[PDB]
Amino acid sequence: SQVRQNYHQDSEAAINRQINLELYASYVYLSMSYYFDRVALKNFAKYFLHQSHEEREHAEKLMKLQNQRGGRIFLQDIQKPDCDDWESGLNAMECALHLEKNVNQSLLELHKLATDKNDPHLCDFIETHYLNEQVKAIKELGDHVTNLRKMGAPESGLAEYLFDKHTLG
Amino acid sequence: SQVRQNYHQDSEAAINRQINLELYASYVYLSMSYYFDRVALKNFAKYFLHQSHEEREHAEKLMKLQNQRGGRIFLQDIQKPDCDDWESGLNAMECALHLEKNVNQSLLELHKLATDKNDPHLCDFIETHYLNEQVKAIKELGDHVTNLRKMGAPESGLAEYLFDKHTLG
Amino acid sequence: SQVRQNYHQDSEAAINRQINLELYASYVYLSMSYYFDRVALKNFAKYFLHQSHEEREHAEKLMKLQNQRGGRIFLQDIQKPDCDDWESGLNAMECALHLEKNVNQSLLELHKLATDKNDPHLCDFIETHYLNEQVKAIKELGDHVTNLRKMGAPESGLAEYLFDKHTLG
Amino acid sequence: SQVRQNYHQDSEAAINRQINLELYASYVYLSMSYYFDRVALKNFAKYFLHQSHEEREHAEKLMKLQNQRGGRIFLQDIQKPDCDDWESGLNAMECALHLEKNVNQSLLELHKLATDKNDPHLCDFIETHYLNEQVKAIKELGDHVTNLRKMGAPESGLAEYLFDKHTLG
Amino acid sequence: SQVRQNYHQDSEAAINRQINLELYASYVYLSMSYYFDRVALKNFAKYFLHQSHEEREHAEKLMKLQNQRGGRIFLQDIQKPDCDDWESGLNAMECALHLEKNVNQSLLELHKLATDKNDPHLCDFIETHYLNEQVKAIKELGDHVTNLRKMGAPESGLAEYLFDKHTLG
Amino acid sequence: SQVRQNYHQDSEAAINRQINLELYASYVYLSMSYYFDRVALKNFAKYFLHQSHEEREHAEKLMKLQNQRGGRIFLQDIQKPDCDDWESGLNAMECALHLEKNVNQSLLELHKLATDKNDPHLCDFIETHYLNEQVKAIKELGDHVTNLRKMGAPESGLAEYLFDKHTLG
Ligand SMILES: [Ca+2]
Ligand SMILES: [Ca+2]
Ligand SMILES: [Ca+2]
Ligand SMILES: [Ca+2]
Ligand SMILES: [Ca+2]
Ligand SMILES: [Ca+2]
Ligand SMILES: [Cl-]
Ligand SMILES: [Cl-]
Ligand SMILES: [Cl-]
Ligand SMILES: [Cl-]
Ligand SMILES: [Cl-]
Ligand SMILES: [Cl-]
Ligand SMILES: [Cl-]
Ligand SMILES: [Cl-]
Ligand SMILES: [Cl-]
Ligand SMILES: [Cl-]
Ligand SMILES: [Cl-]
Ligand SMILES: [Cl-]
Ligand SMILES: [Fe+3]
Ligand SMILES: [Fe+3]
Ligand SMILES: [Fe+3]
Ligand SMILES: [Fe+3]
Ligand SMILES: [Fe+3]
Ligand SMILES: [Fe+3]
Ligand SMILES: [Fe+3]
Ligand SMILES: [Fe+3]
Ligand SMILES: [Fe+3]
Ligand SMILES: [Fe+3]
Ligand SMILES: [Fe+3]
Ligand SMILES: [Fe+3]
Ligand SMILES: [Mg+2]
Ligand SMILES: [Mg+2]
Ligand SMILES: [Mg+2]
Ligand SMILES: [Mg+2]
Ligand SMILES: [Mg+2]
Ligand SMILES: [Mg+2]
Ligand SMILES: [Mg+2]
Ligand SMILES: [Mg+2]
Ligand SMILES: [Mg+2]
Ligand SMILES: [Mg+2]
Ligand SMILES: [Mg+2]
Ligand SMILES: [Mg+2]
Ligand SMILES: [Mg+2]
Ligand SMILES: [Mg+2]
Ligand SMILES: [Mg+2]
Ligand SMILES: [Mg+2]
Ligand SMILES: [Mg+2]
Ligand SMILES: [Mg+2]
Ligand SMILES: [Mg+2]
Ligand SMILES: [Mg+2]
Ligand SMILES: [Mg+2]
Ligand SMILES: [Mg+2]
Ligand SMILES: [Mg+2]
Ligand SMILES: [Mg+2]
Ligand SMILES: [Mg+2]
Ligand SMILES: [Mg+2]
């Protein structure tokens, strides 16, 4: 590649792995969205559909980065989510929180690699477009979990209904 | 399901298979798009990115249909595309044409099943939202293949450059 | 905390210390502002009041960060400023310069800690919202000191009057 | 001071004490605000942040008064609030009510002093800018306490959630 | 300097060297622009003139940085470009690509120095204003080279003419 | 050159020398500008930055002329200015006046050459775009020197401060 410069093969591979993980997160959220479409919590459905589109954008930005740095995108299967039945609004929020913490850990390992390979452009890319977005998403999901639990979810179906209307609406 | 009516278990399964195929088509087009981003044919890249978003919409409409009819969505892995290197604008257009004819065949088998199970709502759904969209997409890809070949692609890099500017721009 | 991830207890403590320092800086500037209100240099008063509001915003952003990362805010007394009588516009500018260099040193020690604990989100937070703001503030105060000295302050009361009108007005 | 007239040294001192108390109230409300930011009651957080800014304005108006009357501002440490963990929306409202009644008592003692020193300008200043503001704030906090208790707080987390949405939102 | 803080003499010197390099890049692009003005490829001329103005802005931002950090600007001769006759649009694009990779390498060495001297403000400055701009410029020039070669340049004068109209126009 | 007509080789060379001198003047003014940025005379800095951009335009117009007449641009190193520390606003204005008189002398020698070679287009070009611009710039710099001296510069730092505000602001 005539453009490649200071771009380690290990970073290229790690970026391909992160592309797959962002697409996976998009698929999990898509599944969650249509679960809540089925069980008639329309604002849970809207919230997770928006999250799913955001993760596709996350994946696309990494694909652009791979090309910008003179690497080559290598795609892999997007694994299906762990569940098709997400049980409750609270359970889906807890699963999303767990997912985003896992994605954050992968981004931190990616940043450690970029640091170890002295790749400041890649470090800046991760910090600028991913790390604070993860922190905000984790706190937001934590906040939703906190409120749903305090309201009496998941036993209180009234709680999940009112949360759908007042927080996600 | 208290809403399910005249919705055969075989149709439910076939709709889940079609959801996966539409997501697969979306992934193929996403791959094609970023291949052309890499090799600097920006309007090929834009064309296939738009196609990829359209297929995600196709998948989402089938997921909504599954829920509307009282079925249950069962997702599967989204397989990676056959190639990561799509070779040329002409080759990608030929591969997309082949893909859309395969998707059309699956939709026609779906319609045959809905006909065999006397499900006129499902027949109408397929006809209204999928069958003419497929015919239009197949003719459009065929037209692109026809013009690229007539211009001298794929040997003529000038041909693919000018097609990118004048047809896809 | 269900949101806390890669957030060292030492960083949490250092962020609480920085919150206190930003509030302290806000209080110093508030004192300076009303000193110049008393001695009738209204644009010195306006300048330092604006600086005081900016430091409160600095403190609030760190409090938000503490919460975002799953830490806990621990507030301490806000110490009164070193003076109630700031003597002259030049002396107040020199004191503000000294204060901002002290705050900068504390932020650099904070960044060293975040670096030592491999916390790239915290490093980015400090760089993005604090480090260049400090450099700009230090140069601006240095510039004000430079001009006031060149004009003949603090002996020339005319100098401070004209600086109030022409630079701070 | 060439402007000082009918301004007793005891009133000057009492005004300096009141400045400190208003800044203290601002700090208490700032603490309460970010507690509710942490535990995800965003409209409690907004309500107390607004209250904190109002108290800073209260302090600034007294600092302006001190200067207007030819006195000298003497600042003291701003003590940290009694708690960092405010327990519940109800508890924070009860603590704020107690604080505002304490501030009101200090303002009434200030007015008694201004009356005893035959300072009608100071009496009018306190009446015009502070006394009715205190009465309104006390009744408002009392009303919030009344409603939260009637709704079942603090045991009912649903109560505090719905109060956050419907009264503070 | 009363403003200088955590700013190593080696970094100051390296910033002066980078100022000279950015001015040099501006001069190379100015030369390329008027070469294409002479041989009547007006959009090549416009493209490189814009690039030349961008590099002057790059140099000016580093001069501002030098002053902001309490250093002193030391200018050196701006060397003339390697060629006055740039041969072809393709050759100029290849020369610009080589230049931008050389400038990128100098910026990465600058970042390594700022890292070695624990200067996070300087690291952030380089990352924020220079490193991604370099990556984008390198990929863009690589893309132009890729397309011109695929079109048949430099032998095909038609290729360079059409590229001037369709990509740079 | 198929366009060259009545364009002597000596004039072509003299135009290349004038291009270099205009770029040199641009560099001197750029240096002066950032000197005043450093020592906090912001309107001196703005004035000289504008002058520096004007000289780059002067150089570009001569480069266009060289091409228009069928000559060839030959660039040379742009020498660094005589000083990096310009001492005072008055000294910089005196140095700029000296520079512009030197540039004027070179333009008058250029016009003498164009006259000697019976090149009326070149004579008109110099008269139309350069000679009156030089006379205006020389008188303007002379006026600035006159006022700064009358105000008490360079000993009076107040003088330079007020001139920065009232004449250059
Ligand atoms: Ca950065
Ligand atoms: Ca129909
Ligand atoms: Ca960063
Ligand atoms: Ca009254
Ligand atoms: Ca940064
Ligand atoms: Ca004429
Ligand atoms: Cl590399
Ligand atoms: Cl981010
Ligand atoms: Cl059925
Ligand atoms: Cl259709
Ligand atoms: Cl942790
Ligand atoms: Cl900053
Ligand atoms: Cl009195
Ligand atoms: Cl009132
Ligand atoms: Cl230093
Ligand atoms: Cl950048
Ligand atoms: Cl001739
Ligand atoms: Cl003129
Ligand atoms: Fe998200
Ligand atoms: Fe993501
Ligand atoms: Fe399509
Ligand atoms: Fe489709
Ligand atoms: Fe500030
Ligand atoms: Fe601050
Ligand atoms: Fe209030
Ligand atoms: Fe108050
Ligand atoms: Fe550029
Ligand atoms: Fe540059
Ligand atoms: Fe000029
Ligand atoms: Fe000139
Ligand atoms: Mg490879
Ligand atoms: Mg599996
Ligand atoms: Mg290395
Ligand atoms: Mg950011
Ligand atoms: Mg079933
Ligand atoms: Mg496989
Ligand atoms: Mg039947
Ligand atoms: Mg139709
Ligand atoms: Mg703790
Ligand atoms: Mg003390
Ligand atoms: Mg660690
Ligand atoms: Mg920044
Ligand atoms: Mg006294
Ligand atoms: Mg204490
Ligand atoms: Mg009396
Ligand atoms: Mg009233
Ligand atoms: Mg030095
Ligand atoms: Mg040389
Ligand atoms: Mg050090
Ligand atoms: Mg860093
Ligand atoms: Mg950036
Ligand atoms: Mg010649
Ligand atoms: Mg020399
Ligand atoms: Mg002749
Ligand atoms: Mg004449
Ligand atoms: Mg004229």
Swiss-Prot record, chains A, B, C, D, E, F:
Pfam family, one: Ferritin
Tree of life domain: Eukaryota
Keywords, sorted A to Z: Acetylation, Cytoplasm, Cytoplasmic vesicle, Iron, Iron storage, Lysosome, Metal-binding, Neurodegeneration, Oxidoreductase, Phosphoprotein
GO biological process, one term: immune response
CC annotations in GO: autolysosome; autophagosome; cytoplasm; cytosol; extracellular exosome; extracellular region; ferritin complex; ficolin-1-rich granule lumen
Site feature Essential for association with cargo receptor NCOA4, where: 17
Binding site for Fe cation 2: 55, 100, 134
Protein name listed in UniProt: Ferritin heavy chain
Keyword Acetylation in annotation: yes
Main function: Stores iron in a soluble, non-toxic, readily available form. Important for iron homeostasis. Has ferroxidase activity. Iron is taken up in the ferrous form and deposited as ferric hydroxides after oxidation. Also plays a role in delivery of iron to cells. Mediates iron uptake in capsule cells of the developing kidney. Delivery to lysosomes is mediated by the cargo receptor NCOA4 for autophagic degradation and release of iron.
Reactions this protein catalyses: 4 Fe(2+) + O2 + 4 H(+) = 4 Fe(3+) + 2 H2O
Family annotation (PANTHER family): FERRITIN (PTHR11431), FERRITIN HEAVY CHAIN (PTHR11431:SF37)
Ranges for domain Ferritin-like diiron: 5-152
Localization of this protein: Cytoplasm; Lysosome; Cytoplasmic vesicle, Autophagosome
Phenotypic consequence of residue 100 to A: No effect on iron binding but the oxidation rate is severely reduced
GO molecular function, one term: iron ion binding
Major localization listed first in the record, in broad terms: cytoplasm
Gene3D superfamilies, A to Z: 1.20.1260.10
Binding positions for Fe cation 1 per the UniProt entry: 22, 55, 58
